[model samples]
Each structure stands twice: as structure tokens, then as C-alpha cells.
Target chain A: NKINASPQAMLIVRLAAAQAPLHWQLFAPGEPHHEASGRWPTDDASPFPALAEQYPAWVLIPASDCAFHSLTLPAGLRKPPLQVAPFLLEEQLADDVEATHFALLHRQQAQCEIVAVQRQKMRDWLARCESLSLQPLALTPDVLALPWQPPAWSAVQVDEQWLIRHQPWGGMAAENVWLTELLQSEAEEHVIDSYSPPPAAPGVWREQPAQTLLTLAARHPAAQKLSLLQGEFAVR
Target chain B: NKINASPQAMLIVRLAAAQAPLHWQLFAPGEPHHEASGRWPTDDASPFPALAEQYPAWVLIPASDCAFHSLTLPAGLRKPPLQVAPFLLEEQLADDVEATHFALLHRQQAQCEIVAVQRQKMRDWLARCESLSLQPLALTPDVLALPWQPPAWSAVQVDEQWLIRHQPWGGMAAENVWLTELLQSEAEEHVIDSYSPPPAAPGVWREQPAQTLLTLAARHPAAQKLSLLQGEFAVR
Candidate 1:
């Protein structure tokens, strides 16, 4: 990706909530099956059994714990979206807005996708990766990592909102109950497209969103993935 | 796992190459009822000693290093290649003319599928099973257990060869060149469009040859499997 400078042997981690352990799978650049797959056996467990052998590597995490939303860009706004991120999410943010960290997923002339994880949670995730000898390259929610169908619509459910990317420029995080309505409203013209499971295991997978992101990525390598390392939260 | 113990807990073992660990899976009676599977970590690893706690059981060992040949039965092969496999695959094997184990996978007036393994590998597998208090039910090549379909065909890939079941009476295990030639002999084929990911994880597995076997098996379960344990190796 023009966005991702390829790091050798990047491990993709899909973080889980509700006291579940984080499960991760490794992909070396062009290799077919992953090298190995295992889970964080315990909350304090390292992500890989070979963690001691890993150093100077990037880790991609799905920050589904974060708040996700879509905002229509204000007309005549010429400044960098990162600078105006807080204001874009202002109406939805709680009174304690100062505690949040905003990261841009994708931006267009008409709208922007901004993700917010609490500053504390963000730092905790960063430190946890460091402890496991992992560099946090992209800590994104599962939806943004989905195969970006710029001209089409793709949606993933997490954090009580259905994160939808209905267009290249804009998307929304509507309530689950509001999904069909959201699709009905947002994708007024563009049709809904569900991804196919990987070739060998058809129907073995009941479709879901972020998990489908990784699988869809495997099937369609050309599909671009959005990273949440926007302005300040990025590692220099 | 307890739900699976009753069907006599048959095991399927595929010997690997280059000293790689042997991969095996449990079959709970019916062909579809396959249970937990993993590799034999070391030469000393006995798959069924702990299984002895569950009591008496049978094992299915697919002598992976065997030579499998599909012959339109020459009237003589119908006598059960009990003493014929070694001479039949004689030109194929390069060593030890005196040490060969022959078995018949299938027999028909029009065709016969015969398999052969080195006597040493066959005995090693059988003795290992005996040490673990397991009985040998069928010692066939892995492909022979592939549930056969009369109206349709199924196939598996082993050692760079596509082992195809073009018919219940015939099959072929040959390289890409012979594979096309075999398929060339039989048309009416619906090419596979997908491959499932490896177990417990999605998107990890790439499309492959053996994925077709399970897909066809699900489509037809009562389809008879070709057991190579004919003559002496046959279950009493």
C-alpha cells in the first residue's frame, strides 16, 4: 500500500473485548498460508510464542474498543481535517471531550471518517504492544481495515454502531437497529455488496465485519485498507 | 470430544516427507464424523496411548509413501493384488524389489486401483499402532479413503500430483501433465470456485487440491470409500 511501507513479516492482530484473549495471525509478504496462528493465552500473555525472536516489527491492531463515527465535511473548510477532528465529532462527544484522542481513517472533500479511543486506552495498547516487542503501526477499528470499496459500500458492526463506508468520501456509524435504515438512507443508489468467504472454506464462515476484513484482504490483495495512524497518534 | 468416543474412534494418519511431522485426524465411525487432528510432534509420539484411556479402538493408516496405480483390471488383477502390487509398480519404484507391501483399493471388471508402500514404512506404522494398543482397520493410501462418488468425481493433491477420482471404477494420481490428460479422458466437470481457510481462522488457507475432496464428500456421504486394506490388511 502507498500508505503502508511494507515491514517484513507483519503480524495482524484482531483485538477482542469482553475479557477475551487477543488472537493474532502472522503473514509474511507473499506467502500463501500464514506462518502460524495462536492467541494471547492470558490477558498478560505475549501475542506470539516466538516473541523473543521478534524485534523491530510492526503490529496492526483492531481497536474495536474505540468510538467510531462519520461526519460530513463542513463546506469551505480548507484546513487539515486532523486539526478540525474534535469539532467534527463535537456534537457526539461527551462533556469530557478533552480526554479523547482523534485519528483520521480517511478524508474526502465532503466528509471524513474519524476514530476516537480514549487517551488512556490508546496509551495502554501502545505499551502492551511494546512489551510484546511489537511496534504499533496501525491501531484501527476493524471496519476501517475492511477492503475499501471506494465506489461501493461496505459495513462492519462493532462498538454498538454499524460502521459503513458507503462512498469514497464518506461513511457512517449508525446504531445496529438503524442498519437497514442506514443502508436504505446512505446507500440510496450504491448497492450493498457482501464479501465472499475465502475459496477453500466456502459457507464455513458465517459472514461478519472486521473478521471479514482480513479474509477479504487475503482474497483481494488489491483492496486498500485504511490505517488509523492519522496526525499525532502516529509513531514517528 | 466425549460426543465422539462411541463410534470406535478410528484414526487416519498421513505420513509426511522430509521428516516433517505426521498429520492425522480422528474419524468417529461415519466418514463425515471427523474429530480433532494435529501432528505427531516426534518419532516417539504415539497418537493413541492416551486414547487407550478411552478403551479399545481401530486406526486407519494411509501409507503415504505408496505408489497408487489405476489399472483397467486386466482380469488377473481381480485376483486381489495381494502378491501383485510390487510387480505392478515394479518399474515405478527404484529400490528394494523384495521389500514391498501391496494392497488393493478398488476392483471392477473395467478397472482396478492398487496401492503399494515400502514394507518397512507399513510395518513401522502398524507396530506403532500396536504399541499404543490400537488395531489396524485399514492401511491404505490417503487418497483411497476419499469417499467415492459414482455419478460424480472427487480428488486430492499429494506430492505435487493431482489424484483425481474420475469415476468410481477409475482414478488417477499423476503430475500436472497427466492430471490434465486424466481429466481430458473425462469431461463433465464443474471446476471448484473456492477454498476454505484453515480451521479456527479465516482467510489463512489458500485454494488447493484436497479442498475439493471435503466439498464433494459433503455433497455425497453414502458414496463408498475405496479401502486398500484388502487381503491381509483388511479388517476381520
Candidate 2:
């Protein structure tokens, strides 16, 4: 009798590019819905109505617009440490602190991890959503949409581009050739261990192929601990 | 740079009824902004250009529509307690459990706290935000909007109405005269404690008049711990 309790399909959208003529995938993790990977041209509203009417979507931003950084500090650094973060690293940053949007990912063993993006990047992402009259549940960085395991590293792909998330605080995005060299080089330096389910030893982790997007999409709920949308960038 | 760093105005809304016509206030906590309140006159496109333009507001809901309940069960009742909550109390409910929206507010020391509202009520509040083209940073409950002092109780106003919060998990709403009587009854029953430049034993509390809406609106930020808009209800 209560249709409102109907399980609205969940949507995981990976936002590619900045505007209307962009690419996206709509799917509910672990289920058979009208899953899709398609492009929108000229901000038209046709491709989304059915999906939007069915589920609350989670939007994944491109790795390029998201920056993850980690900081280790004294055990005590006042409350809401992120508020004081930009000030502590103000000199190290090239951009004006005011122009950057910061979100604390997580804090562990006296280390504070965070993600920062240009304030304009936020406005742009928001504008895209507004154009479609869609309010995303979480604007997670696509890098975070990858799996994470302490002492190990993971990588995923979107087209020819590759994204490697090293830690909650930070990760990098690169093209195929550079990514292999980069990962191999980082491994020699003992920076990151490798993981691919059928595991590898530390310093030997390799990038796994992207076979199932929904399986990866399913990982996002807990992956939110590293979400960059917080503080000024927080959605609600 | 400095301008973006400055906190934008925060609007804390307490919705008393539904539909296109209503009233709301815009004020950042502890700051004096263009504070104004007027009727919505049928959910028209007017009355919100200011708030919609000024900042992403924080929506505060009245307690009448948000229900908070507590349960002391095994440390780990089952995985995902909120999903299991409605079933646990299904027999105790007068309405069909299928019609209600349930969320776990907090969990601690063998105690699980939860908040529930009708699915329609949640949609109505969201619809109100949609009509005005406003997206709140949080849709927090006013019971949470009221500042908390752990075991000590607190009270505030929405016109002649009164809200007395016993804890993050419990509270009561009453009219002026009845509010006093309710407090007295709770005190006599040793149900609550109090404070406000005021002393409160373990079982006593008092009420203070509201000077301005900001007086209560200012209490919203920390109350975010009690926010109900999450998962499918999330708006960012």
C-alpha cells in the first residue's frame, strides 16, 4: 500500500568532462535496471528522466578536478582540524587558500587526510547538475570510487586514462604508458603494495582491468570516508 | 580570496505545515544578516531569490514531524540496525511500518538511537526546497537544531510553542503554558536535568524565552549530528 517505500533504483554516474556534451553511466549496484553509458549533447534533458524518476544518483567527479593530500601533525591541533588546515599549509600552496575547496577525508594515527579542488570546479560540477535538475546524493571523486586497502594500492580505468588511489589523502591520474612506469617506479621505492584479489606482494601491486562497474560502484558507500565533498563543498 | 573564505549566510527553516504557502527565516549562526520572514503564498517562485542566491541554507525541521526513539539491545543487534528497526517495532506501531521512513541517528554503548518520519513528509519538505530552487547544506531536525548538553535538557520557541530536548535521542514539544507543566511533570518524575547559566540536578531543567529566531537558529551546526537526510534522502 505504501509505494513510497518502493526501493528506488540507485544510480552511480561517473561524470566525464565539464559540460553538457559529456559522458555518464547510470546503474544500480548489483542489480538489473536500465543501466547505461551514454553521452548528453547540448544540455538536453531526455536521457535522464526515467533514471532520475527512479533513483537517487551518486555522481563521480573526474580525478583531475580532485586532489588528495595527507598531513601528519601533533596529536592535538584544536577541534574541526580542517578549519585550520589551509592556514597550516598556506605557504606550501601555490593557489590562494580562499580559492581552494577542502574536505577532510579521515584522520588516523595522528595523520589527517584531505581532498582539495578549485572552488570553481565545485561550481562547475554543481552547474552541470542544476542544468539537469538533478541533485546528486554524493559528489565523490572518481578516484575514490576505486577500492582502497592500507599498505596496498589500486587502480582503475576510464577510456585510455588511468586513476591510481594510493591513500585516502592522495592519488594520481595518468595515461597508460606513464601510469605503468609511475607504478613500477613507486613500487621500487617501496611506496605502495599491489592488490588484485588474487593478491600480489608489497611493492608489486598492478592495475586491474575494469570489468564490472557496478561491483566497483557497490564499494562507494564505505568509500565515502575519503569523499572530498565536505565543509564548503558539502552537499547536505 | 578573503570573500570566499567568509561563511555565507545560513538559513535554518522550521516547517510547521505543508503546501505552497509558508514562512522561513535566513540567518547565519551568531551573525546578523538580512533576517526576514514572510509567507510563501502557495509555493510560488518568489520569496526565496535572496536565500537561494545568498548561500546554500541549512533546513531545520520541527520535532512534530521527526520522531526519535531509543533501543537498548545487544551490543550488536544485527547488521544494519536501521533496516531492522521498523521490524523490531512493527508490532508497537499503529500505522503500517511500510509507510514510514526510518534512519539510525546514533549508536553507543549498547544503545541505538533512531529517527523516523513519514515518507511523504520527507518528500514534502524536499518538494518545498525544490520549488524555491534552494538546496540546503543539511536538512536537520529542530530537535537537533536546539543545542545539546548531554544529560542536561534545553528549550526554545517557535511562536508560543515550546520544544524541550531531553537528550539527542529524546524530547518533547508543547505550547507555552503546557510546556511549563510538561517540564514540571518531567522534573517531578525525575526524567530530565537542566542548564542555562542555570543549575540542574540529574532530574531537573528549565525553559528560557527566545529573543530572536537567530537565538534558536544559531544552534543548528553542531546539531548536524542528528540530521535525517541521508542515503536516498541526501541532497548535495
Candidate 3:
């Protein structure tokens, strides 16, 4: 029963997103270039050779989707070894902002695996763009919705974007759950290829697909993000 | 990351018994020798078959380890679950007292999946052994461990026995990381009889033997159990 509520909650979020006028785009590393290619600054040539070494591997574009056009990161930056949050840049002024025209900047930082390689270039780029016009937004108690109140912000309507920003910190305890569902949905639709059935018998009962089981388990009521946030926030 | 924790937590609880000594045996429906074995006191020779039809994959035994054994379902039972507190059962009373033989008889619910099938008669035969003297007595928490911390309890221990109960919950908490470790260990042990690499590049990177992942994951620090009485309950 605790595991059943998550999926239902996710479904509601999906429905809400579907009803709202929002464009959901995934900006993984190495995505194919197309007409939308120029919308994001492209570097056909760069000093980084490891990008070619790990050519097929995609680098996540940190906080790419924004309403403005330029950003930069500080020199001699060292990226955190294991940070989950991505770098972000936002426009300072909403005035004269084109709804469809948005830019993503990269912040350059050294990669842990390839220390010589600057990994936060994307983050730096985004920061530079934000400095030009986008305003950085911070997630606080008041900006988020409480369980008893309506949501104050929408994932689709936020201005400045931070990679690991906007987590469910205070009243918007459900944001984590909502975002998890969205990300999982994207994983389901894009990441997972095919389900592998368990072996016939005699050997052992193999575990079901992680994504499928995860999706189902997310539906549990006790699995809500609030429960998680409470443990994270250590609410009394 | 968040979704991975919830189910992994539940799995940690299930895998806690892997190393602990089995105090009592639990029989699910469809044991092969059910027809010939006269184990359970219930006269219905085919009780298991009927029950299996209703709930084919339900876990017959809840959580049990060398220190404790819990009733399968506490809410529906005619009596409250048994709880043998402390490891002093043998010294507490005469050997003739069934409850005195074990230290604790607390009830704990577990999440499980029916991975296989056995004959109904075999199940019956197994249940009949319920009253028989078993070794490595199961452990249970004292009533004092309840969140309310009812009076009369002293301390809780997360010895080897408790580790068994807590593994499943922890394994479920950080499955992705655990799964990665599990796969690596399985590969090291040459346990990949019928494993296939994931089709996608990233998926291939994550491919590891499922069984190996499950085993190693169960033993990971994140999955290890803790004792509340020792002031060592840390939520990661």
C-alpha cells in the first residue's frame, strides 16, 4: 500500500504537465543536431580532445534551457567529485523575454575521471548567459507549496534553472516526488530499451526490470517524496 | 536516486536473513510434499492450495532471523503476534514452556515475491513442523522498541542477527549503487551463466549479474541494520 501511491501521484503530475502549455525537452550529451541546433551555442572545434575519446558518451548540458543567451564560468574551477546538482543560469529580467527563445550556458570545471579536462565548461557557459540577462532563482520555504496549500511554482514555469536547485526543501515537499516521476518517465520512454525475462527455472528467480519495479514501487503511499524529504530535512 | 531508495529499503529487510541462523522454517503454498506430510495441526489437508489460489505469491512467513520470528499477518490473526524479547528465553522459564525456549517473538511484516512454486502437500508438511523444536531461535524486538517506546524495554541490538533483518531494507534503499557493486562482484565470482549485456552503451556499462548484485547489495553498508537501543540508528 505504501508503494502504490507514488505512481498515482506521478500520473497526476504528468496529467498536470500535459494540461499546461509547456515544452519538455531532454538535453543529454551527444543528442543529434537539428534545426534547434543553433538555439544552443555549438562548438564544432574545441581544445578538449577527450571529448573525442569519449565521443559516444554524452555529457549532460548543465542548466541549458533558459530564456537568455550567454554565460561563463570562473577560471581555475574545480568541480565537486560527486555532486548531483547541475550548474544553472537564468535571465535577470523577464521583460522583453521571448517565450520560445532560450539559451543554455555551460560552466567549465575539471572532471574527476579526467582531471585535465574541463567538465564545467557547460556550467560556465550557462552562468555567463545568466549574467547577461537571466536572474538566478533560489528555492526557499515560501516559494514552494505546502501539503495543505496550492503549489507556488511549476517545474514548467520556473525562470532561472539550476540543475540540482528547486528540490523539495520546505512547503513544496511534493516537488521531489513530482520531479522523480518526470525523470522516471523520461527514463522509461528513452533510457530503457527492452525488458529481460527471468530465466526459465531451477537457477533462481531473477529480479524484475529495475525501471518497471521502480515505477510500480513509486506508487506506494509511504513512498511519497515528503517521507523522503522528512528524513532528509530531519523534521521534528 | 530517490525512487531507488524506497524499494531498496524494503528489499534490505527481506535479505536480512541470508546470514542469520534459521530458528524456524517457513512454508509457502505449493510445497512438493504437502499431500504426504502431516505438519500443520489444521485438519484441512488442502488448506495451502486454497490459500495459494487467493494469494498465490504472498510470503507465508514475515521477517525471521536467529533472534526473532514474527507472525505473517498481525492484523488478521486471531492473536497478536508473538514477541520473545532479549536473548534470555532459555533461562527465563522451564524448558516445557514453548515461549520460554526463545528469546523474543515479536511480529514484523516483510515485502516478498513468490519466485517459485512447490506442491501444496509439501507446504502442509512444512507447516506441520511449526510446533517441532527448532534450532537457532528467531529474534524479535521487545515491545519497548515501538515508536511509542512502551515501558519495560531495555535495549535493542543489531548483532549479526539483526543485520539479517535489516539487509533487505537497506538493499532496497540504494539499489542502483548496490546493483552496480553487485554486478561487479558477480562478474568477479564468474557467476554469469545466463547473463546478457544491456543493449545501450550506458546500459551495457551497468550490466552485471543480477544475483551477484542482489547478494552484494544485501551486504553493503547502506543495507546493514542498526540497533535503536544502542543509539546507533543512522538514516542515510
User: How does model 1 score by TM-score?
Assistant: 0.37
Error of 3 at A214 (Å): 20
TM-score winner between 1 and 3, please give it.
Answer: 1
Label model 3 with its docking quality class.
Answer: incorrect
Instruction: Please give each candidate's TM-score.
Output: 0.37, 0.58, 0.20
Give the per-residue lDDT of model 2 (tens digit) for A1-236.
Answer: 11111122345666666643554556542234445655555355555655555555677777777666667655565435566568766765657899988776665555666677788878877777767656565677776766666566666556656666676556777775675566566646343332232223234545454344334755445443345555555543
Error of 2 at B1 (Å): 30
Model 2 per-residue lDDT at B119: 79
> What's the best-to-worst order under lDDT?
2, 1, 3
Could you tell me the C-alpha RMSD of candidate 3 in Å? Answer: 26.4
> What TM-score is obtained by chain A of candidate 2?
0.75
Give per-candidate clash totals.
7, 5, 84
Q: DockQ (Cα-based) per candidate?
A: 0.01, 0.07, 0.01
Tens-place lDDT per residue, model 2, B10-80, is: 55566657743445676543233446555555455554665565556677777877777776654545445
Model 2, runs deviating above 4 Å:
A1-10, A18-49, A65-133, A145-162, A183-188, A191-236, B1-10, B17-48, B68-128, B146-162, B167-170, B176-202, B206-236
Question: Which lDDT tens digits does candidate 3 get at residues A1-236?
Answer: 01110001111110011123211122111123211111122254431232212211111121222222223333455332212112322234343322222211122243111001012332343343233222111111211211121121122112222112122222111233343554444323222111223222121222334322112222222223222111111111
Pairs in clash, predicted candidate 1: A199-B194, A199-B195, A200-B194, A200-B195, A200-B196, A201-B195, A201-B196
Q: How far is A233's C-alpha from truth in model 3 (Å)?
A: 3.7
